[PDB]
Amino acid sequence: PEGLDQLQAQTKFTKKELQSLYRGFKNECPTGLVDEDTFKLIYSQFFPQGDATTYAHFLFNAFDADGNGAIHFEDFVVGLSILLRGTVHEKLKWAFNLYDINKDGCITKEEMLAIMKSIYDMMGRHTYPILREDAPLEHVERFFQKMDRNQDGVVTIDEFLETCQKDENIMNSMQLFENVI
């Protein structure tokens, strides 16, 4: 059908790259539509060992567009644009949205604690001797003390930006750590 050329018109890509991203979605999910459950199967294939189950759910929230639980290849191609054609700013927004799934739109050292636990349970790598054992607290503590501050108590995209912007190497490290995920 003309569902192809049409999608291309919306997205900002060439009929070539468009037909490419489409095939990938058809090769990784020759079913038609995608669902939360599937999203898990995807991250599972690229990361079988470990958990990734909790973080997988959070990932879904990142995608989608004010819709229900059923997604498609479109919203997926668009995201690709955010990652492909997107500077650190757009990324900061995408990463910030991930660190949040509950109501409201603010962050807190609490929600951050649960996030660290998820990544901690996912860390299935630990070969070779290692001294440091575990301490997901000191980290979330320095991050909140460095960013969180205003009376609002909770960190918002603003407070977040104010930090990641006037940052020196803090949020920069976060990106390096997120690069793996």
Binding site for Ca ion (CB under 5 A): 100, 102, 104, 148, 150, 152, 155
* Residue 143 C-beta: closest distance to Ca ion, Å: 11
- Residue 71 host element (H or E): strand 70-71
Of 5 and 158, nearer to Ca ion (C-beta) is 158
Of 34 and 147, nearer to Ca ion (C-beta) is 147
* Residue 115 C-beta: closest distance to Ca ion, Å: 11
* Residue 87 C-beta: closest distance to Ca ion, Å: 25
Residue closest to Ca ion, measured at CB: 148
Binding-site entries: 100, 102, 104, 106, 111, 148, 150, 152, 159
Of 5 and 152, nearer to Ca ion (C-beta) is 152
Binding-site entries for Ca(2+): 100, 102, 104, 106, 111, 148, 150, 152, 159
- 3-class SS string, 6-58: HHHHHCCCCHHHHHHHHHHHHHHCCCCCEEHHHHHHHHHHHCCCCCCHHHHHH
* Residue 166 C-beta: closest distance to Ca ion, Å: 15
Of 18 and 100, nearer to Ca ion (C-beta) is 100
Q: What 8-state DSSP symbol labels residue 107?
A: B
- In the chain, the N- to C-terminal Cα span, in Å, equals 36
Overall size of the chain counted in residues: 181
Separation between Cα atoms, residue 178 and residue 115, nearest integer Å: 13
